[PDB]
């Protein structure tokens, strides 16, 4: 179940980074 | 321009010479072609 | 609303954020990809080797046997339940002697049964052009028994119970053995040999002698580096570098016994009163590398209880 | 910075546009060649199995 | 800065290519050059 | 930079154009020779197998 | 630079033209001799087989 | 101009000399020609 | 002029002397001529 | 003139002395003349 959790944390990190970049870059 | 023509030529020639020497020496040491006995 | 207008308003300051993020991502990706590629295309590092007789030595591929000597083997064994005309191997039947010959004599030298003695009648002595090889083999067996019962028995049981057999010195070659090969003569002069004419309990002592100088120290260093190369453990394997004369590591007494054994081999079998005459081994001096081959225990050594009891350290 | 588009003018120069275009084309060509070579190597001998 | 990015990318690519070819050759898993 | 083409004027000097042209021709010739040599060597003894 | 041709004026001096001619002639002679020597050595003993 | 004639001459002559010496030494050490007592 | 007469003379003389010494030493050491025992 | 008399004299004297010493040493070391035992 390790790879599923790795994908989950990676997706969360990507989503947070994109959201904060969009907030700053506007 | 960010880089000069002289530096580009120097780097390219040095890299080419080093690569050619390395490739000939490695192919000679591999003993895969029957070249020079 | 922002707290850093110079970083979140201007384009030049707005570029640095993306530049740093890209740099971190590129570094992580490159490291991960290189290490994944390295760990995916590499073979399994350590394959263990198991063999019920030898210690890291193998003889299972037996293509050197002509396959007709094996055919005559069973006929001989069936004809004679007990050995006939045997002078060394005693206390064993024909089946056990045949097993010893197949696994040890032929396995250790990688030669056919016809190399030494005739397949037609295994008991013949001097009716064929290969009797000299059989005589040399008998002398080799007697030498091995002497070495086992006089020197290996002195080592403690901590080292193990490994014995000396044909494959210890031969390592799969019938002849043309190479003590002092070129690959082990790296840092030393190309014509250096072990000083086998000295008394090793005090032969190589230099510390504070005041009757020697740098030349004797150089000779001592050559011998010591040879002892290092013949194993793979470095200069501390037998020594404590704070004081070399000390006897505390417990492999230095073993080295004393080994040195005495090598001197005995040199002065009794290699060249007793002339290497050319009255001496087996064709005048080749022994070496630590000959048996040990860069390991603590020789690969050709046999496990305890494997060799015949007549040749064993405790017959 | 006359040749540079208005969006990228504050960061770039006239010659840096041309050098950047050359580098971009070189990267794309190298990527295509690498993809072809990797596919050929996989067809010759898989490494994952 | 454009120059620093170009230099870093070029050196990184060269080093990775050389290291990967050496590793693949030393692996002995492809039957290349004997 | 009279001889240099218009698009390459902000990148090249008049004397550097000739040296660059010489280098380009040399690289082309070397590439053709290398292709021929590689084809001959493969025809002699393959290295991939 | 009276002797230097019109194309090569921006790169060469009048004094360097003659030395360049000498170097070119020497290189051509060296290549001819090298070709002869290589043919002779191949006729003596092939090095590829 | 990008380079002077003197530097080009020096580099070319040095490269030629080193390459000639290296090739002669390699051919001599290869022992594949029967030259100068094998 | 790119080079002086002095520099050319010096380089040529040093190269010639070194090459002559090297060739004589190689020929003597090869032991293929039966010269000087 | 490219060279002066002093430099030529010094270089020639040094070269001659070095060559003579080297030749005597090589001849003595060769052991092919029966000179000095
Ligand atoms: C695997 C199970 C492990 C363990 C693994 C971890 C790991 C791993 C972590 C924690 C972290 C924490 N753990 Mg825990 N934890 C364990 C057991 C415990 C126990 C316990 C008594 O058993 C306790 C009390 C805690 C308590 C805690 C907290 C202190 C903390 C999570 C809340 C927090 O800080 O929110 C406050 C934090 C935030 C609000 C951060 C939110 C960040 C958002 C998502 C943005 C990310 C960056 C964004 C993309 C950047 C954008 C802009 C850029 C310019 C691009 N853990 C066990 C032993 N725990 C996490 C932590 O945050 O530690 C500091 C953490 O990383
Ligand atoms: C080390 C490299 C050499 C050099 C080698 C070349 C070569 C060679 C060429 C140029 C050409 C150009 N160079 Mg130059 N050039 C150098 C230095 C410079 C410098 C400088 C230092 O200031 C500048 C400003 C330039 C600028 C330029 C332009 C004047 C010109 C057109 C570029 C273009 O459109 O690229 C945009 C195009 C690309 C980036 C193409 C990218 C293609 C990729 C790499 C894929 C190729 C795959 C290949 C075909 C695969 C073969 C596989 C096998 C068959 C198995 N060069 C150095 C000294 N240059 C070209 C020219 O003269 O055009 C008339 C040309 O042919
Ligand atoms: C193991 C199975 C295959 C194999 C599998 C692969 C695979 C798979 C690939 C390659 C790739 C390549 N292989 Mg390989 N390879 C094999 C055997 C070989 C042999 C050989 C002698 O046997 C050779 C010579 C090569 C050679 C090569 C190259 C053509 C290429 C990597 C180039 C590189 O370094 O890019 C990195 C180089 C750089 C980043 C530097 C670029 C520099 C530019 C081009 C020059 C100008 C610089 C400029 C002047 C700088 C100015 C700025 C400075 C700051 C001043 N392969 C075997 C047979 N090989 C790769 C490829 O196709 O790449 C396109 C690839 O993906
Ligand atoms: C025999 C088959 C061998 C092998 C042996 C070699 C050898 C040997 C060499 C190469 C070289 C190269 N190999 Mg190959 N190579 C093999 C398989 C491969 C594979 C593969 C995936 O299988 C690939 C991708 C390559 C790719 C390459 C290229 C990177 C390179 C040739 C082109 C180049 O860059 O020219 C760019 C270089 C130039 C344009 C140089 C031009 C120089 C000019 C012609 C002057 C030369 C000197 C001359 C005497 C000057 C005279 C005049 C005086 C100066 C006055 N090889 C197999 C394993 N390969 C050659 C190379 O140069 O690598 C760097 C090289 O030496
Ligand atoms: C291995 C089988 C063959 C053999 C195979 C070959 C082959 C094949 C070739 C040679 C070539 C040569 N061989 Mg060979 N060779 C053999 C045995 C020998 C023996 C010997 C002791 O037996 C000798 C002495 C030589 C000597 C030589 C040279 C005559 C020549 C290489 C010249 C050179 O160094 O160019 C290196 C120098 C340069 C490239 C540049 C030199 C530039 C000028 C001359 C420098 C002069 C000084 C300068 C003007 C000073 C002032 C200016 C400064 C800038 C200040 N060979 C054996 C018998 N030999 C090569 C040849 O024919 O070349 C023409 C060649 O291709
Ligand atoms: C015997 C066969 C050997 C071999 C032995 C050699 C040897 C030995 C040499 C070469 C050299 C070379 N070899 Mg070949 N070579 C072999 C196979 C090959 C193969 C191949 C694919 O099989 C190739 C491509 C080559 C290619 C080459 C070239 C790189 C080069 C010759 C051209 C050159 O630079 O001329 C240009 C050369 C010159 C301009 C030199 C000019 C020198 C002038 C004439 C002065 C000479 C000395 C004279 C006494 C001076 C007197 C006056 C005073 C100075 C006042 N060889 C085989 C394995 N080859 C030669 C070389 O130059 O390497 C760098 C060299 O020495
Ligand atoms: C015996 C046969 C040997 C051999 C032995 C030698 C020896 C030994 C030498 C040569 C030398 C040379 N060899 Mg040959 N050589 C062999 C095979 C070859 C082969 C070949 C392919 O087989 C080749 C191409 C060569 C090529 C060459 C030339 C590079 C060179 C002769 C020409 C020269 O430079 O003249 C130009 C030479 C001069 C202008 C010399 C002028 C000297 C002046 C006159 C001063 C002389 C000394 C005098 C005492 C001064 C007195 C007064 C005081 C100054 C006050 N050799 C074989 C293996 N060769 C010679 C050389 O110079 O190599 C660099 C050298 O020493
Ligand atoms: C191997 C068989 C023979 C033998 C065979 C030969 C042969 C053959 C020859 C010699 C020659 C000589 N031999 Mg012998 N030789 C043998 C044994 C010996 C023994 C010995 C201890 O056994 C000795 C001492 C010598 C000694 C000598 C020298 C007298 C002479 C070389 C002189 C010299 O260096 O010129 C080189 C000297 C110089 C270049 C320097 C000159 C300096 C002048 C004289 C003084 C003033 C300097 C000035 C002020 C400087 C100004 C500038 C400064 C920068 C300020 N031979 C054996 C027995 N010998 C050679 C000869 O005859 O020479 C005439 C010769 O050809
Ligand atoms: C024994 C036979 C040996 C041998 C042994 C030697 C020895 C030993 C020497 C030579 C020397 C030389 N050898 Mg011979 N040589 C042999 C074979 C050869 C061969 C050959 C192809 O076989 C050749 C070409 C040569 C060639 C040469 C010359 C380079 C040189 C002699 C002439 C010279 O330089 O005069 C020019 C010389 C001078 C102008 C010197 C003048 C010195 C003056 C007279 C002062 C002398 C010193 C004196 C103490 C001063 C005293 C007073 C105080 C100043 C107050 N030899 C054989 C194998 N040869 C000698 C030499 O000088 O080499 C450099 C030398 O030492
Ligand atoms: C490693 C290179 C190494 C060094 C160094 C070294 C030194 C050394 C000395 C200086 C002595 C003699 C000093 C004295 O006064 O007695 C000495 C003697 C023996 N050593 Fe040693 N030694 C090095 C390596 C090794 C190794 C790896 C071993 C074990 C195989 C070993 C053993 C011995 C033995 C035995 C002696 C006794 C010599 C004798 O009594 O004649 N050494 N060493």
H20 C-alpha vs ligand 4 centroid, how far in Å? Answer: 19
How many CA atoms does the CB half-sphere of C235 hold within 13 Å?
Answer: 11
Say if residues C280 and C141 touch (Cβ distance below 8 Å): no
CA–centroid distance, I24 to ligand 9, in Å, is 16
Contact I31 H9 (CB under 8 A): no
Contacts 24+ apart (CB under 8 A), C84-88: C84/C123, C85/C123, C85/C125, C87/C138, C88/C138, C88/C141, C88/C142, C88/C145, C88/C310
The whole-angstrom distance between residue E1's C-alpha and the CA centroid of its chain comes to 25
| Burial of F7 from C-beta contacts in 10 A (0-12 / 13-18 / 19+) | exposed
Closest chain G C-alpha to H32 CA, distance in angstroms: 8
Q: How far apart are CA J27 and CA J21, in angstroms?
A: 10
CB F11 less than 6 A from any atom of ligand 2: yes
Shortest-distance Cα residue to atom 61 of ligand 9 = J20
For residue J31, give the chain I residue with the closest CA: I37
Facing residues of C302 across strands?
Answer: C54, C163
Q: Would the CB atoms of D45 and E30 count as touching at under 8 Å?
A: yes
Closest CB to C12: pick one of D10, D47, D48.
D10
How close is the nearest chain C Cα to the Cα of D36, in Å?
A: 18
Mutation probe of ligand 8 site: the residue of J20, J23, J25, J31 with most atoms within 8 A of C-beta: J20
CB contact, 8 Å: H3 with chain B? yes
Task: Tell me how far CA of residue C99 lies from CA of A9, C73, C82, C105, I13, in angstroms.
Answer: 64, 10, 14, 9, 78
Dihedral sign of CA atoms H23, H26, H32, H37 in order: positive
CB contact under 8 A, A25 and C2: no
Protein residue with least CA distance to atom 15, ligand 5: H24
Tell me the DSSP string of C260-302. HHHHHHIIIII-TT-SSSS-TTSS----HHHHHSSSSS-TTPB
Contacts of D9 (CB under 8 A, 6+ apart): D1
Contact C89, C97 (CB under 8 A): yes
Alpha carbon of D23 to ligand 2 centroid (Å): 10
Nearest CA to ligand 9 atom 59: J23
Residue G16 DSSP code: H
Query: Does any ligand 2 atom lie closer than 6 A to the CB of residue D26?
Result: yes
Helix/strand/coil for D41: helix
CA D12 – CA C156 distance, rounded (Å): 80
Q: How distant is the Cα of C10 from the closest Cα of chain E, in angstroms?
A: 16
C71 contacts C290 by C-beta, under 8 angstroms: no
Q: Which chains does chain C touch, 3 or more C-beta pairs < 8 A?
A: A, D, E
Q: How far is C37 from chain D (nearest CA, A)?
A: 10
C168 CB burial (10 A radius; 0-12, 13-18, 19+): buried
Sign of CA dihedral G18, G22, G28, G29: positive
Backbone angles phi, psi at C54, to 5 degrees: -90, 165
Residue E27 is nearest to which of C19, C34, C42, comparing CB atoms?
C42
Under DSSP, the state recorded for G9 is: T
Report CA dihedral (F22, F23, F28, F34) to the nearest 10 degrees: 130
Chain F partners within 8 Å of H3 (Cβ): 19
Cα–Cα distance, C273 to C11 (Å, whole number)? 95
Measured in residues, chain G has a length of 49
Phi, psi angles (nearest 5°) of residue C216: -65, -40
Instruction: Residue D1: list chain C partners with CB under 8 A.
Output: none
Taking the Cβ of residue G6 and every Cβ of chain F, the question of whether any pair is shorter than 8 Å is answered with no
State the smallest CA–CA distance between residue G10 and chain F in angstroms. 6
CA J37 to CA J29: how far, in whole Å? 12
I31 labelled as ligand-binding?
no
Which residue's CA is the nearest one to ligand 2's atom 1?
Answer: B12
Of the candidates G29, E34, F23, the one whose C-alpha atom is nearest the C-alpha of residue B9 is F23
DSSP class of I34: -
Q: Determine the Cα–Cα distance for residues C306 and F21; give it in Å rounded to an integer.
A: 79
Token readout for F16 is: 């550097």
Which residue from G8, G10, G48 is facing F14, i.e. has the nearest CB?
G10
Is there contact between H and I if contact means ≥3 C-beta pairs under 8 Å?
Answer: yes
Phi, psi angle pair for C142, to nearest 5°: -65, -40
Q: Who contacts B25 (Cβ-Cβ below 8 Å, separation ≥6)?
A: none
Structure tokens at C239: 């020594």
Judge contact between C192 and C185, C-beta under 8 A. yes
Is-contact C166 C140, C-beta < 8 A? yes
* CA-based nearest residue to D15, from F8, C11, B12, E1: F8
J31: alpha, beta or left? (left if phi > 0; alpha if psi -120 to 50):
left
Q: How far is CA C174 from CA C111, C230, C246, I26, in A?
A: 7, 22, 41, 41
Contact yes or no for C150/C263 (Cβ under 8 A):
no
Is residue C292 within 8 A of residue C129, CB to CB? The reply is no
Structure tokens at C4: 């850093």
- Ligand 5 pocket member I35 (CB < 6 A): no
CA-closest candidate to residue C130, choices C140, C119, C143: C119
C160 in Cβ contact with C304 (< 8 Å): yes
Contacting residues for C216 by C-beta, under 8 A, at least 6 apart: C206, C209
Q: Which of C117, C115, C50, C106 has its CA nearest to residue C83?
A: C117
For residue H36, what is the DSSP state? S
Per-position b or e across F14-49, b if 16+ CB within 10 A of its CB: ebbbbbbeebeeeeeeeeeeeeeeeeeeeeeeeeee
For residue H3, what is the nearest residue in chain G, using CA coordinates?
Answer: G11
Mutate to test the interface with F, among B2, B5, B28, B35 (most CBs of F within 10 A): B5
Residue A20 per-residue DSSP state: H
User: How big, in percent rounded to 5, are the helix, strand and coil portions of chain A?
Assistant: 90, 0, 10
Task: DSSP for chain F, please give it.
Answer: --SS-STTTTT--HHHHHHHHHHHHHHHHHHHHHHHHHHHHHHH--S--
Pairwise CA distance, residues F29 & F37, whole Å: 12
Ligand 6 midpoint to CA C137 (Å) = 59
- What is the DSSP code string of chain C? --S-HHHHTSHHHHHHHHHHHHHHHHHHHHHHHHHHHHHHSPPPS------SSBSS------TTS-SSHHHHHHHHHHH-SS--S-SS--S--HHHHHHHIIIIIHHHHT--GGGTS-SS-TT--SSSTTHHHHHHHHHHHHHHHHHHHHTGGGS-TTS---B--HHHHSSS-SS---SS-GGG-SSS-TT----TTS-TTTTT--TT-SS--HHHHHHHHHHHHHHHHTSSS-TTSS--TT-TT---SSSHHHHHHHHHHHHHHIIIII-TT-SSSS-TTSS----HHHHHSSSSS-TTPBPTT-S-TTTSS--
For ligand 2, atom 49, the nearest C-alpha belongs to D29
> Hey, what are C232's tokens?
């793979």
Six-digit token string for F6: 């218009």
Strand partners, C164: none
Binding site of E for bacteriochlorophyll a, by residue number, is 21, 32
**Binding site: which residues of E?**
21, 32
Q: Which residues of A touch C14 (CB under 8 A)?
A: 24-25
Q: Using CA atoms, how far apart are residues C16 and E25, in angstroms rounded to an integer?
A: 40
With a CB cutoff of 8 Å and minimum separation 6, the contacts of I32 are: H36, H37
Q: Let me know how long chain A is.
A: 26
Q: By the CB < 8 Å criterion, does H37 face chain I? A: yes
């Amino acid at each position: 179940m390790a790879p599923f959790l790795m994908a989950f944390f990676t997706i969360v990190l990507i989503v947070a980074t994109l959201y904060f970049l969009s907030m700053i870059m506007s | 321009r960010p880089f000069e023509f002289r530096t580009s030529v120097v780097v390219s020639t040095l890299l080419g010479l080093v690569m050619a020497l390395l490739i000939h020496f490695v192919v000679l040491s591999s003993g895969a072609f029957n070249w020079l006995r | 609303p922002t707290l850093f207008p110079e970083i979140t308003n201007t384009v030049r300051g707005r570029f640095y954020i993306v530049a740093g993020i890209i740099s971190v991502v590129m570094a992580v990706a490159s490291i991960a990809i290189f290490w994944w590629i390295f760990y995916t295309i590499t073979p399994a590092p350590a394959p263990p080797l198991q063999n019920p007789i030898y210690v890291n030595y193998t003889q299972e591929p037996t293509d050197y046997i002509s396959a007709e000597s094996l055919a005559a083997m069973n006929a001989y064994i069936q004809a004679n339940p007990q050995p006939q005309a045997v002078q060394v191997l005693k206390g064993m039947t024909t089946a056990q002697i045949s097993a010893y010959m197949v696994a040890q004599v032929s396995g250790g030298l990688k030669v056919d049964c016809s190399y030494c003695h005739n397949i037609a009648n295994f008991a013949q002595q001097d009716g064929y052009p290969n009797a000299a090889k059989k005589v040399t083999a008998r002398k080799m067996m007697l030498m091995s028994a002497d070495l086992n019962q006089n020197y290996t028995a002195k080592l403690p049981a901590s080292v193990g119970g490994y014995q000396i057999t044909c494959a210890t010195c031969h390592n799969g070659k019938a002849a043309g053995l190479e003590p002092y090969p070129i690959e082990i003569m790296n840092t030393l002069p190309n014509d250096w040999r072990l000083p086998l004419e000295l008394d090793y309990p005090g032969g190589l002592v230099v510390t504070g002698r005041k009757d020697v100088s740098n030349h004797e120290v150089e000779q001592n260093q050559f011998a010591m580096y040879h002892m290092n190369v013949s194993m793979g453990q470095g200069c501390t394997f037998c020594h404590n570098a704070r004081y070399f004369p000390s006897y505390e590591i417990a492999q230095k007494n073993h080295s004393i016994i080994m040195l005495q054994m090598t001197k005995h081999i040199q002065e009794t079998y290699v060249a007793p009163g002339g290497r050319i005459a009255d001496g087996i081994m064709a005048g080749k001096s022994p070496s630590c590398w000959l048996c040990h081959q860069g390991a603590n225990i020789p690969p050709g050594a046999a496990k305890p209880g494997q060799v015949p009891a007549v040749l064993s350290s405790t017959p | 910075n006359d040749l540079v588009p208005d969006q990228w003018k504050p960061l770039f120069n006239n010659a840096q546009w041309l050098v950047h275009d050359i580098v971009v084309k070189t990267i794309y060509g190298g990527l295509i060649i690498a993809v072809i070579a990797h596919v050929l190597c996989w067809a010759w001998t898989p490494w994952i199995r």
